[PDB]
């Protein structure tokens, strides 16, 4: 039980090993030959720590009169992509080496997405039940104005994000504080931070996200023969059942998705109990229970569950709350064959090695809930675009459809019959669902399923090319570095 | 009788009271109930006024060597979006007041299509037929320079347009003034103002903008049930007839449109007289007799018209020139179903009760003649992408189409037959002509009907809303002011 | 009785119809001749109107939550030498027109006393009384934002100042939150207004400069032969005696530079009642009157004073309050032969004629008080010099005196007897005060006595040359239209 810090150095340490062999002769072989693993060994150790971190203390004036100053941290670990990306924590817990080492994580994780963004992680050293809504926006536009004055924020430079403890009020509150101030002059201002209300220019799609993202990269997996194999199980989603933990935001959705294509949630869990029915809750009934009362317990339709919910007899499990649920205790125990990590750092080192025995399939967090960070890009790019969307598009393609379906109407009638006997227009159903509501998210989410799906399969390779087999962790870490290195290694790096 | 400009304040003030109780409870219900109504009173009071105006007196030479001093006035209503959006006006009528009202008009029409741009709109006291073509460029670059330095022009700032007394030569001389000093840095210079020529990055289909804006929301309400069976009419434009009131561009295009879609002109005038032919005038042969000759007097194919045309026994009238056309005297004998204000406010808010209460149709300007704004937010992206719409696209599609209709026919043909029995590949010859002209124009239009059917649709739903029936013009203020409203509210407003 | 704004416009337009004859033939004579006239006729008429007005209307929060919305205006007569340069009044009698009078009039005022700004003025359309001291930091911040946002505030753009209504803690917010904002980048930034307290980088010696500024101005005056001669009084001020009407910061240091010279003040009134004693009011025992009580009203060495102040027998009258008290009823009373406007414009064009008539020599507002904009343009040289005057320079010139002074000593001890004998060092007593006092101000009074003689014989100069009499009023706006004329001029105007 170490902490989600020292993990990340650890599985960077594992895969920058496991690339620097390889990097000398599988992707290399040049001119200089003895000592180009200084160069391969050098740009890794560029990659490893954090660029640049920013310590602040300022100041609000609470409502009472009195003062009060404020500390708070962002890092940036990489500038190999520009702006950094990455959330901004309320809590007090918040310390430089939390910050550090998500930021970290962050460049990874876009990395592994194909998401161009260096990572970066802020905190603010504060309890937000402590403070009302004018001091708690008091806080953020003062927090703003110091990054951007450091060079900590800006559409070209470093676009923070929620974490929980943060919300879209936040990301509204700075977006407005740079673009009444530093980024008054700069027409991609409101581009500065993601997760913003629609109205302030946030993008549909956004708040499933992170759980269809967990459903697709789930699919992904559980498609593919070999690995479906490698576990006993058929391919697809109708024989499979799944248990969820955790009912926030990423529980939800996934649950919702995984249910849309034939899986059977037998148990949800949260902070409380958690419940059980083995013929399948459903996500809308569920949802609105959790919406109603305070919690889960007692769904009118499933009893609580006994002990814990991470050894249920299912096919996927899906730790979708809490860092480090699955360690070494309950890891010989786990009956699901495939764990999805809905959340962060649900899995100690000490788990990783029992499943990696035992063949079970951990999808780790890295990859499978990066759902969220691939759509910040998307509306970063809306805020550049200045536009939704499919806004000019929609209806072109519409009527290049209809013009679709005509042609190969009065083509087969020219061929056979009369002149309206056969019909091959009619949309079906779901298509004619489809083209009437088309909106954003249809875009977002299509861009979703296809980075989800280009990088599940860059995986894969990953895992073939360095001979990992279930380890999927390792290989997604591999891979990202991989990508990291790329950058540095055909840049040159200084004026050198 | 009052002006355009009492008017417009008006229309506001009815729809900002129409939604402050809404705003109290039917979209809001909150913690702080008492005085709420505090913070939404206040919102809307920052919103009525605009927020800034400049006034310029600045010098040209004039071409015989003497100089001269000029008025000028730009106002900027509201930045909640920003660029501000708006003409710029060349004629001595031009006050503070004028523009100060229009450039609130613009707010409001922007929302309504969801275009977001603020309001602005700016006036040159000077008409035109006084001055040479060359002073007429001094003039227009002078005048750019000094918005500029006032932070009154820019693609991030303020972006105006023509408007009457100006067209596309002056906005290619401010685009041109901007590029080569103060935007000279800026990528985006060209984005600075829209109208532009072509061969300066203005945008394919500008010209027939407003006109085709008006056959789609006309389009929109006539294919609508509830709306034609509460006039007594039936859905569809082949049953119906119209006149058309004024012969520039937007009389002419609004003529051609729903000509091409099955209606019945049957009367057009303009600052003489007018013409009427029951058996349905044709749009190509009337251009082609007003381009040849000065004025429409005297078209071989229609005798002159007596009295007033705005009476004529028809299903829809479309003002498309010079306000307050329809006020209290003629209203009681208007034989119009439909009043589609192709113009701005060619109706007196007494033309507004008489026809509520006769149960005609008034299609509000706001609204209805969007479609030159909606296009030239066009302009503006097509500035900022710095590539014509489609062209890295037409191409992929084409060849997606063919493989489409392609996988239609090896299917068919492995169902029954051989090999090149069943052709239904061939498009169309209308799917064919689309495919050979495809060009920018078609997805600029393709925008324009998308915009003009989702925002006539957000109006009915809001006319429901406060129960209006078809007062529609009260409709579209609301609408307006709800989405206005709801950028300020969800973002704080200063810093506190 | 006109307003203090046609006055303005008048005295402009005859100094200019003055100036346009002699600037044909007597300071130009030219290859072009037949017209340039044209020339000097157009460059007139644009020097005459304002440039740029810019009207806002934005929001504040009140202290009790509730929202205003504040109306506001600057406007910027000349940009000829920039930055521009203007007070900002809290007032709610502001008017567009009251601003774009008295920014004319602050274009004329700096070019007399030779200070490189384009005149400006603002206003603000608040009572002061009716808000908190948090509202007026509130209402100023945010006005500034939209001044810098629009160009109406910069180092080198347009550098504001107080008046009456604000005062240094004003300008002081302003500073700083142009500062903290716009312009966080500017090494110049404090340099945006003037007025500011020492501590936010204010000048020594600016409470006192107006008034001093008046004194110099009069003494100019005074001790010049000729002037003297034609109004029956002897030079120097030893013979005069003195009235004071107003005892604001004007009155109060004009009374006490002209007491430390040898004047005789005999009557000092304000808005309630005046007092009198014809054998001297000490201005130190008046002061510390007017400052331990209310107002001046029974001062224990002074009676009050029957009727009107205006009129007392007495050389030299200070107008120092309130505009329009020499007016046509009292003027043909006026005891008084030299009239020092220490206020504006306290003298009606009706006033002036029978002055003119009298031989009543009146030393005209645009000259004689400015010495407040003389030294706001210290303060603004000040903070781009980031240093106070003479820091550098004091200990070096004391150093520089003691070796002149032993220079003179050795040398005539060597010349006659021995050595010690002969002490031609020791600086006389008040030499020694001035060394050892040696301050910033010291150089800021420098400053402003050079440019009032400077200005006084330009002025006198200009008064010979156009053949005016004792019409010093005319002679100062012929000689501030003159240079502003040169300027435009020697540049050519636009591109042409």
Redesign the interface.
Same mark, same amino acid.
């Not at 008054?184 to 201002?189: Q, V």
């Given at each position: 039980d170490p902490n989600f810090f020292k993990m990340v150095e650890g599985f960077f340490d594992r895969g920058a090993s496991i690339v620097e062999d390889k990097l000398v002769e599988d992707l290399r072989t040049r001119e200089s030959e003895e000592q180009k693993r200084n160069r391969v060994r050098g740009i890794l150790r560029i990659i490893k720590p954090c660029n640049h971190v920013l310590s602040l203390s300022f100041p609000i004036r609470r409502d009472d009169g009195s003062w009060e100053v404020i500390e708070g941290y962002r890092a940036q670990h990489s500038q190999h992509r520009t702006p950094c990306k990455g959330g901004i924590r309320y809590s007090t817990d918040v310390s430089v080496d939390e910050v550090k080492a998500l930021a970290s994580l962050m460049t990874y994780k876009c990395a592994v997405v194909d998401v161009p963004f260096g990572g970066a992680k802020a905190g603010v050293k504060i309890n937000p039940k402590n403070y009302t809504d004018?001091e708690l926006? =008091?806080i953020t %536009?003062r927090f703003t104005?110091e990054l951007a =004055?450091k060079g900590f924020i800006g559409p070209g430079i470093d676009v923070p994000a929620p974490d929980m403890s943060t919300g879209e %009020?936040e990301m509204?509150?700075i977006a407005?504080?740079y673009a009444?101030?530093?980024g008054?002059?700069?027409?991609?201002?409101h581009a500065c931070v993601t997760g913003k209300?629609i109205?302030?220019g946030g993008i549909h799609g956004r708040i499933s996200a992170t759980g269809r993202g967990v459903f697709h990269g789930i699919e992904n997996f559980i498609n593919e023969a070999s690995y479906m194999s490698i576990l006993g199980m058929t391919p697809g989603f109708g024989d499979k059942t799944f248990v969820v933990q955790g009912f926030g935001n990423v529980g939800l959705h996934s649950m919702r998705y995984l249910h849309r294509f034939g899986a059977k949630c037998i148990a949800v869990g949260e902070s409380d109990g958690s419940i059980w029915n083995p013929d399948g809750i459903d996500p809308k009934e569920l949802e609105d229970f959790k919406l109603q009362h305070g919690s889960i317990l007692g769904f009118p339709k499933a009893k609580p569950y006994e002990g814990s919910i991470l050894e249920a007899d299912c096919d996927i499990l899906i730790p979708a709350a809490s860092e480090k649920q699955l360690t070494k205790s309950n890891a010989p125990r786990v009956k699901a064959k495939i764990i999805a990590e809905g959340a962060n750092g649900p899995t100690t080192p000490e788990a990783d090695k029992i499943f990696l025995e035992r063949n079970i399939m951990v999808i780790p967090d890295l990859y499978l809930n990066a759902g969220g960070v691939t759509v910040s890009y998307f509306e970063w790019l809306k805020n550049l675009?200045?536009?939704s969307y499919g %806004?000019?598009?929609? /209806?072109?393609e519409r009527?290049?459809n209809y013009?679709?379906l005509?042609?190969?109407q009065?083509?087969?009638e %020219? /061929?056979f019959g009369k002149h309206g006997g056969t019909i091959p227009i009619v949309p079906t159903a779901e298509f004619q669902d489809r083209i009437s509501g088309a909106s954003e998210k249809d875009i977002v989410y299509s861009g979703l399923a296809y980075t989800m799906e280009r990088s599940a399969r860059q995986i894969m390779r990953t895992a073939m090319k360095y001979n990992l087999g279930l380890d999927l962790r390792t290989a997604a870490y591999v891979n990202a570095i991989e990508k990291v290195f790329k950058v540095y290694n055909e840049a040159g790096v200084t004026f050198t």
């Open positions: 004018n926006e =008091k %536009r104005m =004055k %009020r509204s509150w407005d504080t009444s101030t530093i008054h002059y700069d027409i991609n201002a209300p109205s302030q675009n200045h536009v %806004r000019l598009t929609f /209806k072109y009527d290049s013009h679709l005509m042609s190969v009065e083509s087969l %020219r /061929k």
